[PDB]
Amino acid sequence: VPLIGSLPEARLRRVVGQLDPQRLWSTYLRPLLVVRTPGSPGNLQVRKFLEATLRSLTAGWHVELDPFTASTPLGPVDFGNVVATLDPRAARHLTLACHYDSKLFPPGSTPFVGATDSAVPCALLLELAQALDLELSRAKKQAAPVTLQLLFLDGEEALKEWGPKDSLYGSRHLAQLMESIPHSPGPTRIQAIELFMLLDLLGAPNPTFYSHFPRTVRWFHRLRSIEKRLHRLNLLQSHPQEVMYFQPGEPFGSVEDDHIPFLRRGVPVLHLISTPFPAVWHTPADTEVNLHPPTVHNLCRILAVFLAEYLGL
Ligand SMILES: C[As](C)(=O)[O-]
Ligand SMILES: [Zn+2]
């Protein structure tokens, strides 16, 4: 319950109280729930929405695009990762990541908007940044040596399920780009990532998470402890058992995802992905109505506490 490095209770309740469920849902999630396949108008509109939202935060994040053109099974397609670094001068950062593209389906199909995959992850990152904006701003003004970075990756999904190189367009490109850019102390932007936490497949009822990387299990245990704590504090909804989400062991592994290009370059990863996947995965039923709002807000609360403890907010 109260572990070393945990927020005092009154600090925890104020952090959770800064979250706004209506804002998460309407301001951050709803605008994303459009078809947003790489290169589409909808994808570009979501990119600009992310950029503008992030630039509006009073903490004054450094927000930049990583745009590029890559070969795909459909020919050349443009991709653009959105990279938000709160304090670009800090030595290192906690990096939270997700993908903002939606998987392309055949024409004539019921449109796929990927509510869990990964509109909810994207919206959670925006809500965290906003809810903690005053605290993040003060940490930056105090020149904290560990800042926060948010990555909204493009092109995670295969365009045509056309083999292993038809995937991870944005993350492959960004990891290579970061390895080419000096950082202090660095020596490159890859080494600035103290921990890479990838959110994926979130918002369905009854998710289960396992630790996929022994290297980062301490952070998995922290998330579990936060779940338990929030449960006992009467701060979770529709959560009848003390531990439901963060499970022990590893009955299902990690799957290929946007962490891989980072992992292969030595970055420590925590893969916050439901396994088994949502029932709706990769079907057009992955929509807003099939989300479970209490679970979305429960995850948001867990993550807010994690972020405040990790960064000393
Ligand atoms: C973002 As995925 C787990 O559907 O490849
Ligand atoms: Zn997917």
Side-chain angles (χ1 to χ4, degrees), residues 99 117-118 156-157 200-201 255-257 273 277 281-282:
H99 79 93
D117 184 7
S118 284
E156 186 282 343
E157 296 281 7
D200 197 2
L201 310 187
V255 295
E256 176 182 295
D257 202 349
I273 184 169
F277 289 1
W281 182 81
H282 287 188

Side-chain angles (χ1 to χ4, degrees), residues 22-163:
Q22 188 76 63
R23 180 176 64 206
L24 174 295
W25 206 271
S26 299
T27 308
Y28 303 140
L29 175 60
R30 171 68 60 73
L32 302 178
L33 292 171
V34 300
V35 170
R36 54 193 190 286
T37 57
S40 69
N43 173 293
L44 174 60
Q45 291 151 13
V46 168
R47 180 187 299 157
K48 297 312 279 183
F49 169 85
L50 292 172
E51 283 178 32
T53 298
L54 293 158
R55 287 183 175 117
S56 78
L57 298 167
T58 80
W61 290 69
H62 181 272
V63 180
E64 71 202 319
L65 192 72
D66 169 34
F68 63 98
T69 303
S71 295
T72 83
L74 297 180
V77 173
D78 293 348
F79 298 88
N81 302 305
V82 179
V83 181
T85 309
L86 168 61
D87 184 356
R89 83 207 148 139
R92 300 261 264 177
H93 34 81
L94 175 60
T95 296
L96 319 178
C98 62
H99 79 93
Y100 76 90
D101 61 311
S102 63
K103 179 174 167 63
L104 182 60
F105 278 73
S109 302
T110 306
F112 180 80
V113 301
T116 70
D117 184 7
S118 284
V120 164
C122 289
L124 286 167
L125 296 191
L126 296 174
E127 174 63 14
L128 294 165
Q130 177 69 269
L132 290 163
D133 184 56
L134 302 181
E135 298 80 349
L136 291 166
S137 186
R138 273 153 193 57
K140 179 174 179 180
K141 284 186 144 185
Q142 291 168 5
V146 185
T147 194
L148 186 56
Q149 177 177 255
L150 306 176
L151 303 180
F152 303 82
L153 300 145
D154 199 4
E156 186 282 343
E157 296 281 7
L159 286 148
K160 295 289 292 333
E161 299 180 350
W162 212 252

Side-chain angles (χ1 to χ4, degrees), residues 157-177:
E157 296 281 7
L159 286 148
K160 295 289 292 333
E161 299 180 350
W162 212 252
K165 302 302 191 289
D166 178 26
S167 66
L168 310 187
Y169 294 93
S171 53
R172 283 186 298 144
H173 187 268
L174 184 54
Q176 187 44 52
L177 179 61

Side-chain angles (χ1 to χ4, degrees), residues 114-239:
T116 70
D117 184 7
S118 284
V120 164
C122 289
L124 286 167
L125 296 191
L126 296 174
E127 174 63 14
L128 294 165
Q130 177 69 269
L132 290 163
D133 184 56
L134 302 181
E135 298 80 349
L136 291 166
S137 186
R138 273 153 193 57
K140 179 174 179 180
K141 284 186 144 185
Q142 291 168 5
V146 185
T147 194
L148 186 56
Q149 177 177 255
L150 306 176
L151 303 180
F152 303 82
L153 300 145
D154 199 4
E156 186 282 343
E157 296 281 7
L159 286 148
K160 295 289 292 333
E161 299 180 350
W162 212 252
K165 302 302 191 289
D166 178 26
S167 66
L168 310 187
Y169 294 93
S171 53
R172 283 186 298 144
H173 187 268
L174 184 54
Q176 187 44 52
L177 179 61
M178 284 186 172
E179 159 180 323
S180 80
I181 300 178
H183 187 68
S184 187
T188 79
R189 285 185 176 173
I190 289 292
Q191 289 79 222
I193 304 165
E194 189 177 70
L195 175 63
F196 186 104
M197 184 182 290
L198 177 57
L199 288 59
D200 197 2
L201 310 187
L202 304 180
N206 303 122
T208 49
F209 309 122
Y210 298 86
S211 179
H212 296 297
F213 296 103
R215 181 171 184 197
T216 61
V217 76
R218 71 192 178 289
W219 305 114
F220 186 91
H221 288 322
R222 286 303 311 138
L223 287 163
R224 183 184 341 187
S225 179
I226 293 163
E227 179 182 7
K228 290 179 175 153
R229 186 178 189 199
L230 294 174
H231 179 273
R232 290 183 180 218
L233 297 176
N234 292 134
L235 287 170
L236 304 178
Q237 286 199 114
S238 303
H239 188 269

